[PDB]
Design a protein around this nucleic acid. Structure first.
Lengths: 137, 143, 158, 85, 73, 108, 103
RNA sequence: AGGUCUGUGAUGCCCUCAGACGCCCUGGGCCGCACGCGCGCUACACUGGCGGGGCCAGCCGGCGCCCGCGAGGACGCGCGGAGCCCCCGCCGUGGCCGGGACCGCGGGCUGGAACGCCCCCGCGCACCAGGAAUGUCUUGUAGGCGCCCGCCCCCACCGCG
């Protein structure tokens, strides 16, 4: 399965695949935003959106039957606020970008809702696993 | 990147807005040497101008240098928002601009004059040099 | 998030019930607040931690630390059997050590010949003793004179 | 001064008919039920106080107690709080 | 105080740095920085070129530090 | 000598609601949401009557300034003394606190 | 008939709570079953200055109130409206041990 | 003759008692600043800073959807856990991308009421490991890293853990 391969190669390989295959696209507001109040400058790569997308889908697959809300994901992308001559404190990430990603995924039926939150759909499991096995070699 | 050798047109030290800039620094951190430009505003400006950002400022051909000027006097047209600017809702014309060198010093001087003749608390305090915000004096802050 | 003493862990209801009954052995490891539960059975040499193999545990440098008993005893026994560990409690390193303790203790229980069990004990404890015997020391409480268990607030005489 | 009216412009700007948030604190239903009377006690504000000695300082609201720290050590044993560990 | 460049001024790359390094058994980014008085980044780029060519090879790698061995002898 | 592009001569005799969207967050909150309280409204009305028809004294140090209060003189309290304030456009949208000092500068 | 009734008992001291437990288990073996659930102990904590004035060494009191709770919901349909009463009056009447019954 | 009559329907003797030291209202102040010192917090960098990703706690513990760069907001239900660290890259000894005080435009929250607290763009102070002098510490300890409660309309560089 996906957990039998290191997370590092899967994420970036799958991001490239996603970007090639027109599944998702970076909107316009990406050209001038951070990913959190905790941050300080903007990302240095031009393809950070698809990295986030892949990490998210992997998160959704891991959980399985469970359901994940947007903010709960945003607590997995937190950091630390520095530069205040005051003890540092942890802060939550952003939610607009996460929301856009899940909406884009759900419009493709890779992701399905429920009583609360969303969870992976069988098609998502199919594609994730087939890609993982393909890169297993 | 993959620029090892100085290009034939490498320009060892750039002058712009009366300030001078060196060509060994990466581009977006050199412009920070201007007064009115920082990290956030620079990445945004260059990108709109189709300029590489991880480049040494000495390989900045003048063709890319001029288009950059064209974007720092009329930035709002070029797609940049209005919460990213230095001066939002000017006190007179009510518009929004970005003020670079020389403009800042003149602008800062006139507000104090506005503050002085109007007879506020801040203006009187500025002229004996005290804390303007509510940060406490007395303790600490001594020779 | 996990708590170690939860009933949902000690019984390992994670496994499905028809498969939960093929696991004969049971085992425990621990270190600090960390606890690991192992369900050992018969197979052909496969190990898993939180649904992840042993080669891809995360601190990277300690992979040898968890593989120790294999290269000590030898791979014959482990090749004979198949295991499925699950751990939950404070810290990456604590989890590592708890896991290795559980490995060793469980493979010790698989053999029924007490004599061999004692021989293996001697073979293994000599190299290290925390592979069988849990480390007892645990975090200690603080007092109101200061911001530490034994440190005190600085005192100004004049 | 009932015959006192104001311009309509100066009427819609008036605060919306909303109950002032400051509700005070009624430790028990007994202690209330909702010239000088115009301004006897119009400054409504929380007035939480010890239910023993009536002081407005250092009042443990935790657990719905409302007992001063000083007025507490005495009655703590009766209540059931004990000192161990 | 001291300053070092970030970009090689043309013939400088080959008339020395390439020559010098090729006559070294072991090397690192920082050594070469301190040796011929250039910044570290240029060292990174150059060593990339060279491992591509084949003279040097990696023996230990890591984000903080990697070290090479001269496979030309 | 303008005000957000608005001409001064027009600025006076204008209603607050016309300019409110061209003010800061505090004013918009206080007005559009928290409304206003009765005594302030009577202070405004008294001002109107005086204009239509002596320095107006008061205690309100937290009273935002309206366009109809241009060129007026009003005396406000520091905690001990009543202090005149003369209004002019650039003083609009602000409280009376700034223009009445409760202390004096410290000279040793 | 069947009313899914549940028994909850609360106490601050651990000696009667266990005594009440035994009586109930003894008296509910017939009217169905009544096996207990022991809850995590809710411990109330209060830290106070030992001094009324704030003088000398800063020394602190450490009070607490442990509250123990047990829950027999095992009656269930095995008890009728009157049948719950039977035992509840046959069990000892310890002075302090709050009890509430709900379906 | 240590501290507490300013914790109390604990109190002796004095003082105040209808222009009140009683009680209630409106404002101001307790925070003001040429100066001496006590407990703390943040740093002086490569055994590091920035950007991206992976991942585990305990006293214990609440969440979805949609707007908004964000902080926050409108609706609707009962459900739920992090920093250091590890991996990949950029910077390259420059008071520099170290450090984040001060100041100039702007957007919001609490509240009857901002002088209070949060977020965004720009400006970018002292500081190169600290004299005479001095404090604390023996195993899950020192130190480093963060997380909860108390007081609380809002707010923790404090305090208990």
């Amino acid at each position: 399965s996906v957990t039998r391969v290191p997370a590092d190669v899967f994420i970036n390989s799958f991001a490239a695949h996603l970007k090639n295959r027109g599944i998702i696209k970076c909107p316009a507001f990406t050209d001038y935003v951070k990913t959190g109040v905790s941050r300080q400058y903007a990302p240095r790569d031009a393809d950070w959106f698809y990295i986030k997308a892949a990490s998210v889908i992997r998160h959704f697959y891991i959980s399985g039957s469970h359901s994940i809300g947007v903010a709960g994901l945003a607590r997995k992308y937190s950091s630390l606020q520095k530069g205040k001559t005051t003890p540092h404190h942890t802060k939550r990430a952003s939610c607009k970008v996460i929301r856009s990603i899940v909406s884009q995924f759900l419009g493709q039926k890779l992701l399905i809702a429920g009583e609360r939150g969303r969870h992976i759909s069988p098609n998502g499991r199919k594609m994730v696993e087939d890609f993982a096995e393909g890169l297993q070699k | 990147m993959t620029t090892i050798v100085q290009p034939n047109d490498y320009r060892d030290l750039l002058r712009m807005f009366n300030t001078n800039i060196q060509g060994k620094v990466v581009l977006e951190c050199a412009l920070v040497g201007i007064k009115g430009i920082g990290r956030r505003f620079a990445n945004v400006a260059l990108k709109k101008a189709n300029i590489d950002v991880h480049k040494r400022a000495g390989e900045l051909t003048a063709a890319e240098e001029d288009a950059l000027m064209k974007v720092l006097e009329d930035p709002l047209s070029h797609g940049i928002p209005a919460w990213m600017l230095n001066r939002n809702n000017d006190f007179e014309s009510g518009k929004d601009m970005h003020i670079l060198v020389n403009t800042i010093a003149s602008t800062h001087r006139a507000d104090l004059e506005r503050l002085r003749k109007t007879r506020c608390e801040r203006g009187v305090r500025h002229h004996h040099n005290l804390k303007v915000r509510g940060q406490h004096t007395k303790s600490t802050g001594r020779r | 998030m996990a708590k170690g003493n939860r009933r949902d862990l000690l019984e390992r209801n994670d496994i499905e019930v028809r498969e939960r009954d093929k696991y004969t052995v049971h085992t425990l490891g621990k270190k600090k607040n960390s606890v690991a539960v192992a369900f050992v059975k018969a197979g052909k040499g496969d190990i898993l931690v939180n649904n992840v193999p042993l080669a891809l545990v995360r601190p990277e440098i300690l992979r040898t630390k968890v593989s120790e008993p294999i290269m000590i005893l030898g791979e014959s026994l482990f090749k004979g059997l198949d295991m499925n560990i699950k751990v939950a409690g404070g810290g990456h390193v604590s989890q590592i050590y708890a896991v290795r303790q559980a490995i060793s203790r469980g493979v010790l229980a698989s053999v029924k010949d007490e004599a061999a069990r004692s021989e293996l004990r001697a073979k293994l404890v000599s190299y290290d003793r925390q592979l069988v015997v849990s480390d007892p020391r645990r975090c200690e409480a603080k007092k109101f004179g200061g911001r530490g268990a034994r440190a005190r607030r600085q005192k100004s005489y004049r | 001064r009932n015959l006192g009216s104001c311009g309509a412009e100066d009427l819609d700007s008036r605060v919306h008919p909303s109950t002032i948030f400051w509700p005070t604190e009624a430790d028990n239903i007994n202690l209330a039920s909702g010239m000088r009377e115009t301004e006897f006690c119009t400054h409504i504000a929380h007035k939480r106080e010890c239910r023993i000695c009536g002081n407005y300082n250092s009042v443990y609201r935790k657990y719905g107690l409302f007992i001063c720290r000083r007025c507490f050590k005495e009655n703590a044993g009766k209540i059931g709080f004990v000192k161990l560990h | 105080k001291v300053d070092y460049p970030t970009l090689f001024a043309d013939e400088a790359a080959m008339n020395e740095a390439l020559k010098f390094i090729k006559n070294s058994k072991c090397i690192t980014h920082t050594q070469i920085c301190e040796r011929l008085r250039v910044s570290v980044a240029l060292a990174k780029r150059v060593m990339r070129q060279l491992v591509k060519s084949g003279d040097f090879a990696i023996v230990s790698k890591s984000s903080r530090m990697t070290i090479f061995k001269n496979m030309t002898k | 000598p303008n005000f957000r592009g608005v001409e001064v001569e027009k600025l006076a005799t204008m209603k607050i609601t016309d300019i409110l969207p061209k003010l800061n967050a505090r004013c918009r909150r206080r007005i559009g949401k928290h409304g206003l309280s009765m005594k302030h409204l009577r202070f405004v009305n008294k001002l109107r009557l005086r204009r239509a028809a002596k320095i107006v004294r008061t205690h309100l140090r937290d009273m935002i300034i309206f366009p109809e209060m241009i060129g007026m003189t009003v005396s406000v309290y520091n905690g001990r003394q009543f202090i005149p304030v003369e209004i002019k456009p650039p003083m609009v949208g602000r409280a009376l606190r700034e223009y009445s000092m409760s202390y004096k500068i410290v000279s040793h | 008939m069947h009313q899914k009734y549940t028994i909850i008992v609360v106490g601050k001291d651990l000696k009667l709570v266990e005594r009440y437990v035994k009586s109930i288990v003894k008296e509910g073996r017939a009217f169905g079953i009544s096996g207990p659930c022991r809850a995590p102990v809710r411990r109330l904590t209060i830290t106070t200055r030992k001094s009324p004035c704030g003088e000398g060494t800063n020394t602190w009191h450490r009070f607490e109130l442990r509250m123990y709770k047990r829950t027999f919901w095992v009656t269930c349909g095995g008890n009728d409206i009157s049948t719950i009463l039977s035992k509840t009056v046959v069990i000892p009447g310890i002075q302090v041990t709050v009890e509430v019954e709900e379906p």
